[PDB]
Every structure is written in structure tokens, then in C-alpha cells.
Amino acid sequence: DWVSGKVTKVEYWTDALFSLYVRAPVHPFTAGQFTKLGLEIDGERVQRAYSYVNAPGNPDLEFYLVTVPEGKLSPRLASLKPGDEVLVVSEAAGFFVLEEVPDCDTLWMLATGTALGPYLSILQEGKDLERFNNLVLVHAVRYAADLSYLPLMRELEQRYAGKLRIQTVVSRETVEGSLTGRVPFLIETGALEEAVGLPMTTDTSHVMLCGNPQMVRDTQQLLKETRQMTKHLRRRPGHMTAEHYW
């Protein structure tokens, strides 16, 4: 069921990255889930999926978006202003949630670009992570200026008091404090595990992968070929849980 949402704020982080804040009578959701946003464009209802950034129970629904220049809906969401109406599906969907994650010593959460949101909702909620000894959050972007949620990421790192390790990855420039390259290369060379201080192996880890579908594909391929890791299904458990954004 669609419901009418009210835009409270659009905040731009760069010329292309922005966060959209909404009030809408949605149902409770599980951290990691997504809903759909909708607008009427040229007489047609256009809808896309967007992950909740906010923890469940935060009434300020938050979405981390990138403007796709030739896209249908994202440039229109990008022009929303406080007070504008946006349609929101009241029932969330998705299985990219903690309750579906197998037990493991280390939960790796890998995200590209604007796909960070499910992890932020999970980590801001802060519940049901006791059974994991280690948490690792990796945000991979083109440029350091694209690390829009680095302040929250550092606050979360502080609050988890050493359980959560954060690592930023910047692929198109070299910046102090970040690894340079793409995630598959960084896994294969040992760079990511050296920087984080933890191994990513079948004996220790479960790996969640969110965002760029070619990154998800290539990382799963590499983990399968070199780490003997398998894709996870609820009915057929494995080491790798993925959510593709397109």
C-alpha cells in the first residue's frame, strides 16, 4: 500500500550525492530493509527501491541517493524540496538483515557508493550484534569527497568501542587514511585484511555485499575462486550475502 510522504529536507553532500529525509506513515521495518519511493512523472507513476539509512523507529526516514544524470526518477527526487509530496510503500521488503546472517567470528559489510544505507541502519540500531565478535564496515567510493557518511561512521566506530572496524576505499585518487583501488584487488593482495587487521576466510567470516552489481559479481567471483566461499541462500547457507542496486 502506497502512502503519502512529506519531504522534510534534501541535503546535498556533493553535486551528485544527496540524502532525502521524509515523514510518512510506514510500518515498522527491520534494519537493512528497503522500501519504494514514487513520483508522478508526465502522468505516470514511477517507482524505485531505496534502502532505509535510519534505524527502525527513527521517524525521520532517510535515503542516501546519487543523481543518475539520464535516469527517470533519481533526478526528480533530487529536485524535491521541503514540503513536497513523495509516495512511500508502507511495508518494507528485503532479506539483507541481521537475522538472515549465519553465525561467524567476523561480519564484513562491503558497500559501494550510496549502498551504505542498510549497514548504517543496522549499526545505528545497534541490536543483535552480540553473537559477532568483530564487525567491519568498508565504504568504497570514487573520490574521498564521496564519503558522505564518514562522520557517522567515525561516531559509530567510537560507540562500538573496538568491536566495529571501519575502512574507507577510494578508487580514483590516493588519500591518507584510505585504501586505493577496487575491493577485489584489495582482498586478493591482502591489503584490505592487513589494513583492517582481520582475515576474510570461510573459517572466520560472513561477507555482505551491497551496491554496484559489477562489484558484487566480481567480489563473489574472487572470493569463490581464491577463498572457496559460496553464495548464501536461506535454504542453502553460504558465506556471501548480496544485494544488487541495479
Ligand X SMILES: Cc1cc2nc3c(=O)[nH]c(=O)nc-3n(C[C@H](O)[C@H](O)[C@H](O)COP(=O)(O)OP(=O)(O)OC[C@H]3O[C@@H](n4cnc5c(N)ncnc54)[C@H](O)[C@@H]3O)c2cc1C
Can you say which residues are annotated as belonging to the binding site for Ca(2+)? 60
Q: Using CA atoms, how far apart are residues 26 and 115, in angstroms rounded to an integer?
A: 21
Three-class DSSP category at 138: strand
Contact 54, 121 (CB under 8 A): yes
Stretch that binds ligand X, among 21-29, 62-70, 184-192, 218-226 (CB under 6 A): 62-70
Contact 200, 107 (CB under 8 A): no
CA atoms within 13 A on the CB side of 188: 14
Q: Of 60 and 91, which CB lies nearer to Ca ion in the complex structure?
A: 60
236 in contact with a copy of itself (CB under 8 A) = no
Contact 220, 210 (CB under 8 A): no
Stretch that binds ligand X, among 23-31, 58-66, 103-111, 179-187 (CB under 6 A): 58-66
Q: What is the DSSP string of 192-220?
A: HHHHHT---STTTEEEEEEE-HHHHHHHH
Residue 17 interacts, among a copy of itself, Ca ion, ligand NAP, none and using kind-specific CB cut-offs from 5 to 8 Å, with ligand NAP
Stretch that binds ligand X, among 81-89, 113-121, 219-227, 233-241 (CB under 6 A): 113-121
Choose which of 16, 49, 55, 144 interacts with ligand X (CB under 6 A): 49
The three-point CA angle 242-245-246 to 5° equals 115
182 in contact with a copy of itself (CB under 8 A) = no
Residue 60 interacts, among ligand NAP, ligand X, Ca ion, none and using kind-specific CB cut-offs from 5 to 8 Å, with Ca ion
Q: Using CA atoms, how far apart are residues 125 and 146, in angstroms rounded to an integer?
A: 24
Kindly list the residues in this chain that would bind ligand NAP in the complex (CB under 6 A): 16-17, 66, 69-70, 112-114, 140-143, 146, 171-172, 182-184, 212, 214-215, 218
Kindly list the residues in this chain that would bind ligand X in the complex (CB under 6 A): 34, 48-51, 63-66, 68, 71-74, 113-114, 117, 243, 245-246
